[model samples]
Target: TVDQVEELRRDLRIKSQELEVKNAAANDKLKKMVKDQQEAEKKKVMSQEIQEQLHKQQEVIADKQMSVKEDLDKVEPAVIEAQNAVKSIKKQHLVEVRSMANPPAAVKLALESICLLLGESTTDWKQIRSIIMRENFIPTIVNFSAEEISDAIREKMKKNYMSNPSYNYEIVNRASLACGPMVKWAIAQLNYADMLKRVEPLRNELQKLEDDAKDNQQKANEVEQMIRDLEASIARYKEEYAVLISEAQAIKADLAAVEAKVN
Candidate 1:
């Protein structure tokens, strides 16, 4: 009876050792599963944060596009009108310059020299001279001087005529006095050129606004695409995390069953 009781106690001890080993293995597996679940949860959170950031960026870019488009709308009409005004003045000046006839040889050559200084064509001066003399020539010429013109134009005159000591400055002066109408026309052309200069910056500004609006739209599109991708990634992460959670729960239940048996 003593030998039989001892054998039964030894068998019980071996069975208890087997249960303890199984419980230890189950606990280790559960801890590993929990770590996997934590990693999946972190990925999901990071994806959600990135998605939110993209959404905010999209909003800001959209607003920028709106404002740029608004500015473009306001500037477009003004630019067109200014361009039209320049065109009208250019046409009028062309007509006036074309209506003038050619002057006599000596007068034409003299006028040519003056035109070179003023950067004008020497083709027609007789009609221009007629107009000048008819429109109270003395008063117009008296009111005009080299000082009244642009420095660049004055420099041109000085370089062409005044620089040559042997060249008679009086002849060129007399030619300009006789052809006062041509000088007036040149001045008007300069004024038209000035108008173009003023309008150039407005055109550049409009172009820049258009480009900026386009750039903003492109940025918004890119951000929106990123948001969509992030949303998909977030969804995938959530599905994966759900699966991990189920797996972790199963591990926990297995560990608990092993523990209960061991206890």
Candidate 2:
């Protein structure tokens, strides 16, 4: 009976040792699971924060794009109108100037000034001036000398070049009394040049806005790419998190089984 009792005692000690070992292993596994869960939670929180930041950035860029487009809509019509006005006036001047027959030195000077103001090549005007000067040109209409008319027109053109439209109209009205068609032509050319000056800033503004829109679009595209990359990263994290959850569940089951065995 004593031998049997000692044998029971030895078996009990071995079983206790085995239970202790199982408990220790379970505790170590639980610690590792807790640590992994904490890590996953941290990653999840970080991903959410990054996603929020990216979404906010996207919203800001969208707002900017909307504002830029609104400005474009407001400015485009004005630019078109200004451009068309200059084009129409230029066409009228070209038509009238080309139709003139045996144009006088004063008319030729007016044409040359118009051509120069319209950004046209002055080679024809240069040849005409050289020929006229060589032949001692005389005006058919003696009411106003060519020199007097040319000098007056040049002064008016100089004022027009300086962005003074009031002086241009004054000359146009005065010239109507002497050389009606030629004066009208020069005055119209002056007005067109002044219009061009005014329209330049508008065109520049439109171009700048277009360039800004392009830059904004590029920024938005880059942001979208970043968001996509972040979303992909978040997706990968979610997959890892799912794996961790399953692993944790399996570990919990293993722990429960161990506890039951120990009990």
Candidate 3:
């Protein structure tokens, strides 16, 4: 019995020593784990601070860039406004220069020529006006209603003691001007065109007269009448032509005269 008790006491002593060694190892492991957790939390906080700083720098750079762009936009508008103002001034100066150099004298002379196309005692106002407007460079019929032309024709017609019965001018802006005598004359011309065709035989007669030694009174009279009538038509046409050219030149000169006077 004494040996069994001594053996149990020895076994109990060994178990107590082993348990103390295990508790020391567990305490060391727990302290190391807590210190590692603290280091990881500090690193996370530093990373968040660095990210916020970078975002603030980007915002500052963006604001500077926007200010520079706004300045450029303002400069562009100022340049365009200056260019437009210069162009407008140049155009205005050119218009003033042209207005100063007025051309009117030559035009007046051209109008004077229109006054000379008288058909003996009769005046062909329609033909005279037409020639003035048609072939001349002066008296630029600008912005003129055709009515103005009609009135001019009438006024001139009244001044002329033109018809056989003597009528005052019947020329109205809207009124048509072929007077009774004028219409009869126009119709007669149409007949003369036919008469001219009949007178084709006159070519042979005229040739015979030349072939013969001397022209007789009867032959001469016949030839004279034909020439006289044809000349009558040509005379009026020529008078108007001369008058128109003279008036055109006069009007053109008037423009120069007026400009010279101003200068």
Candidate 4:
């Protein structure tokens, strides 16, 4: 009986050891599976971030392309004009808005705005360049060489006008101007510039009236100081504006000679 009992105890102990080994293997497998799941989650998050970054890059590229398109539109017309100048300025005039005879498109637009402001019509839109372009009158120094008059003049007129009923109109036929730059400049200034021909005398009359009112039942020296300052400011504005006109004329003359055209 003692020998039989000892053998049975030994067998039971072997069985217990086998069960422990199986449990250990099962635990290891569970740990490995958890680790693999964590790594997959991390990879998924990283992929999302990369996708977001790619989207941002695409937006930037699209914005740049849009800007390039706009710049190309403006430059294309100028480039076409440059190619047409067969003998440089001496033979071609890219006349557009702001020229003496055929002003830029913007000039017409501005005129419309002015008419709206003054309760009148600005201009009869003219298509003078089509005819002029067919002629052989050489380009003057004052004519723009880098860009067509169309682009430059239109930008300016848009700045000062752009929205006015007086602007809506029919196109007219404009001839080439002998002096383009100065005429354009003057037209740009329009009636706003205090004219020496009429403005100087009108200003003087205003001064005389102010002088006559100086002895009125006014507050004190404040009124006198105010009038003096106002007059000074007016004078300065006129002088500065006149200087600008003269400068434009000088520039036009210089370019005219450089281009070797008859001014």
Candidate 5:
């Protein structure tokens, strides 16, 4: 029984060493797993933060987009009025200017710039007016030589374009200024979503890797405990082995030999 116990002791020690090697191998995988997991965690958090940023931006975009829509609606009647005015005014006014014995070059160029800005050739009046208002180019037309535009057009201008608060200065300039940037700003807000399209997939993959690494690390920890238990068992068995071996040798001594020695 004692010798068998000794074999058991030796067997435990050998197994402990083998298990220790397996522990080292497990640790190698664990070390890299931890590194990969930490990186994955960082990206996971980064993606979350990016999503929140997109949320806030889209909120602003939704609010501002509605605002631009209402502003467009309010400005529609005026824009249509301008569109109707352009066709009549250009014919009458441009005809007179050409008929003039000598039209001033500066006046012609100024008139041309206005027509080009509006692109009298096209009827996208809303955008045309939006550009004029946004560029604060209304004053450019207002500052034109009174001789260039027909007197009738100028009189109508006061009732139509000039009277417009948005077309006027100081007060509605802020409103005018708000329109272009808001449209562009809202679009920029939309662009933030494009970032998520790319980042979302990457974050998903990283999250998966993090989950995988977590499982591996858990198994590594179990292996570590097993190695510790095995090593402790090896030490205990060796301790018992010394005492058991001594007891077995003592049991082999003859009882009669011992009594003679005592005499």
Candidate 6:
């Protein structure tokens, strides 16, 4: 019986991995789409570069959208088939497995697998139904200002549901709704610290350059003053040269008169 359960698990694991890979890719594409929109919104005036990036993102999103949908269509039936197999062996196989005082590892793992399946079902009901009627479902969901963090939590939930089959479904299902978003917000805050780390050095360098500009102005002013002083010295030298030449001419004229009187 355990052999049959293990064999079934083997099959389910393969299907689960296939779905998980495809879904992770889709999630990446979706996040990129959201990120692109956010980036596009930040630009008040769009330049050629920004417009080009947005245009490229449009093509990427469309292509990935179709690819993701195709994967979803294929993965869903495989999932249902695996679910059908699980449902077939659950009550008899899992009940006996659950009933054990200290179930063996195989039996315990099998029981948890069943719980994950049921947990997903419980999670679905709360999302769709108007009022909470489920036994395990809680009404502790909170609202947020930004949808991105909330979306991140929802993405995390689906990821855990698929990948973390061993974890307690109740906690993973409920706790992540709050904790994941909080963590996302914290990470966002941490990014600002990183931004400061990058910007501080540049800011300091700019301040130094600004201070150096004052020294440049002072140096230029000093050189200009020296140039004016040199020009004044040149003007005084020209005036002295002119007066000396005039005195030489006057002495030559007196010498000429003295020669005529002697003759």
Summed backbone clashes in each candidate are 0, 0, 23, 14, 0, 0
lDDT for 32 (candidate 3): 49
Q: How many backbone clashes does candidate 6 have?
A: 0
Compared with the true structure, what per-residue lDDT tens digits does model 2 show for residues 72-167? 555444433433332243334443434455655455544455444333454385464443232222222112212223334445567544344433
- Cα lDDT computed for each candidate against the true fold: 0.48, 0.48, 0.37, 0.41, 0.42, 0.40
Q: TM-score, each model?
A: 0.34, 0.40, 0.25, 0.30, 0.32, 0.29
Q: Give the Å error, residue 131, model 4.
A: 31
After superposition, the stretches of candidate 6 with alpha carbons farther than 4 Å from their true spots are 1-188
Q: Judging by TM-score against the true structure, name the best candidate.
A: 2
RMSD (Cα, Å) for all candidates, in order, is 13.4, 11.8, 53.0, 39.4, 18.3, 40.2
Question: Which lDDT tens digits does candidate 3 get at residues 1-263?
Answer: 55855554455455445444444444444444445445544544554554455455445545544554553454344333422332333334323222333323222222232242221222344443344333231222222112222323433433442332222223310121222222222223223333333444544544553334133333445544554554555455456545645554454455455446434
Q: Select the stronger candidate by lDDT from 1 and 3.
A: 1
Look at candidate 6 and give me any clashing residue pairs: none
What are the per-residue Cα lDDT tens digits for candidate 4 across 1-263?
A: 55855665565455445545544544554455455545545545554554555455555545544554554554354333433432443333344332446555544443343333223333444433332244432333223232223333444455554333333222211333222332333233332221222333545554554444442323334444554554555455456545655554454455445335321
Ranking by TM-score: 2, 1, 5, 4, 6, 3
Compared with the true structure, the alpha-carbon lDDT of candidate 2 equals 0.48
* Model 6 RMSD vs true structure: 40.2
Better of 2 and 5 by TM-score: 2
Winner of 4 and 6 under TM-score: 4
Candidate 1, pairs of clashing residues = none
lDDT of 1 at 190: 38
